[PDB]
Write a protein that holds these residues in place. Structure first.
Motif, short mmCIF file in Angstrom:
data_model
loop_
_atom_site.label_atom_id
_atom_site.label_comp_id
_atom_site.label_asym_id
_atom_site.label_seq_id
_atom_site.Cartn_x
_atom_site.Cartn_y
_atom_site.Cartn_z
N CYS A 177 15.41 78.48 29.92
CA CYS A 177 16.73 78.73 29.25
C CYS A 177 16.46 79.29 27.89
N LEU A 178 17.28 80.33 27.53
CA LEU A 178 17.24 80.82 26.25
C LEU A 178 17.50 79.79 25.10
N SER A 179 18.22 78.72 25.41
CA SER A 179 18.65 77.70 24.48
C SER A 179 17.67 76.50 24.43
N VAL A 180 16.67 76.49 25.32
CA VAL A 180 15.77 75.38 25.44
C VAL A 180 14.36 75.80 25.04
N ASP A 181 13.83 75.16 24.03
CA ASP A 181 12.50 75.47 23.45
C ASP A 181 11.54 74.34 23.82
N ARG A 182 11.51 73.92 25.07
CA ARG A 182 10.70 72.78 25.57
C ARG A 182 10.24 73.24 26.87
N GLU A 183 9.03 72.83 27.24
CA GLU A 183 8.56 73.04 28.61
C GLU A 183 9.23 72.06 29.56
N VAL A 184 9.81 72.58 30.65
CA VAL A 184 10.53 71.69 31.57
C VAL A 184 10.10 72.03 33.00
N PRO A 185 9.28 71.17 33.57
CA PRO A 185 8.78 71.40 34.93
C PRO A 185 9.74 71.00 36.01
N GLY A 186 9.65 71.67 37.14
CA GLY A 186 10.26 71.17 38.34
C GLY A 186 11.20 72.12 39.06
N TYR A 187 11.51 71.74 40.32
CA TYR A 187 12.36 72.55 41.14
C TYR A 187 13.85 72.27 40.77
N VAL A 188 14.50 73.37 40.37
CA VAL A 188 15.99 73.24 40.04
C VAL A 188 16.70 73.53 41.38
N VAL A 189 17.26 72.44 41.95
CA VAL A 189 17.78 72.53 43.34
C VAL A 189 19.18 73.07 43.31
N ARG A 190 19.37 74.22 43.94
CA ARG A 190 20.59 74.91 43.97
C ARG A 190 21.05 75.19 45.43
N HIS A 191 22.28 75.69 45.60
CA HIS A 191 22.69 76.16 46.93
C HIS A 191 21.85 77.40 47.30
N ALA A 192 21.34 77.47 48.58
CA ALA A 192 20.66 78.73 48.96
C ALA A 192 21.56 79.95 48.78
#
Ligand SMILES: O=C(Cc1c[nH]c2ccc(Br)cc12)NO
Ligand SMILES: [Zn+2]
Ligand SMILES: [Zn+2]
Ligand SMILES: [Zn+2]
Ligand SMILES: [Zn+2]
Ligand SMILES: [Zn+2]
Ligand SMILES: [Zn+2]
Ligand SMILES: [Zn+2]
Ligand SMILES: [Zn+2]
Length: 203
Positions: free
Chosen positions: A130-145
């Motif tokens: 995210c442009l607004s997030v200056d942190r490393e954030v791991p993981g699968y962002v689960v969305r609708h296919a």
């Protein structure tokens, strides 16, 4: 106001216009825009698409201090309106030929929404950010296919559109912003890389 700063003819959006994690604007439900659009909302849309084109252009990105990105939502500019821009590029082949279509999706959307979707879920293998997030954030962002969206363009014309693949992911990510949802809200709390059987992992 913020809007007044952004819609100045000579003003180019850049990272100093993007609000940060923690700003309450990112957690609001953005307000629907009314048609016919005001001048400010039309210009805002155009400046947002220009930001994405600049973020993709090695020269302009370097001049303005941007990195390549594929979407932007008005809340990220401290503007609590239901306005998103999406610009998802296709890639050159192995021989260096440009694609037949520069973009798989290129739109400024007003009042966009998911009206239906697949039972199947999908996630980018590489996670999100995210442009607004200056942190490393791991993981699968689960969305609708797959999603079916409705939205209005700057002229007021309504569109109904099915999306899949990357396009689907990006649009969902941006719509989340206008609902006050952050990507990490959709990462598994205990195991970021948990895979529920049948999840489509997009490479
Ligand atoms: O914050 C953003 C841009 C952005 C930066 N890193 C990302 C990774 C995946 C996706 Br989908 C979107 C982004 N648009 O709101
Ligand atoms: Zn600025
Ligand atoms: Zn215009
Ligand atoms: Zn330009
Ligand atoms: Zn549903
Ligand atoms: Zn975002
Ligand atoms: Zn949904
Ligand atoms: Zn409908
Ligand atoms: Zn969490």
């Amino acid at each position: 106001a913020a809007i007044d700063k952004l819609v100045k003819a000579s003003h180019l959006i850049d990272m100093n216009d993007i609000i940060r994690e923690g700003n309450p604007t990112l957690r609001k439900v953005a307000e629907e825009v009314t048609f016919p659009l005001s001048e400010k909302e039309e210009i805002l849309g155009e400046k947002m698409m220009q930001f994405l084109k600049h973020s993709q252009d090695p020269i302009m990105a370097e001049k303005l201090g941007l990195r390549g990105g594929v979407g932007l939502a008005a809340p990220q500019l401290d503007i609590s309106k239901r306005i998103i821009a999406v610009l998802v590029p296709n890639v050159e082949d192995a021989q260096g030929n440009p694609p037949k279509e520069a973009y798989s999706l290129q739109e400024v959307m007003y009042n966009p929404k998911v009206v239906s979707h697949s039972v199947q879920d999908a996630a980018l293998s590489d996670g999100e950010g995210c442009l607004s997030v200056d942190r490393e954030v791991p993981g699968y962002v689960v969305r609708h296919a797959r999603v079916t969206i409705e939205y209005f363009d700057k002229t007021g014309e309504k569109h109904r559109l099915k999306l899949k693949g990357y396009n689907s992911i990006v649009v969902q990510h941006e719509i989340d912003h206008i609902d006050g949802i952050m990507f990490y809200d959709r990462i598994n709390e205990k195991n970021p890389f948990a895979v529920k059987e049948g999840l489509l992992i997009l490479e």
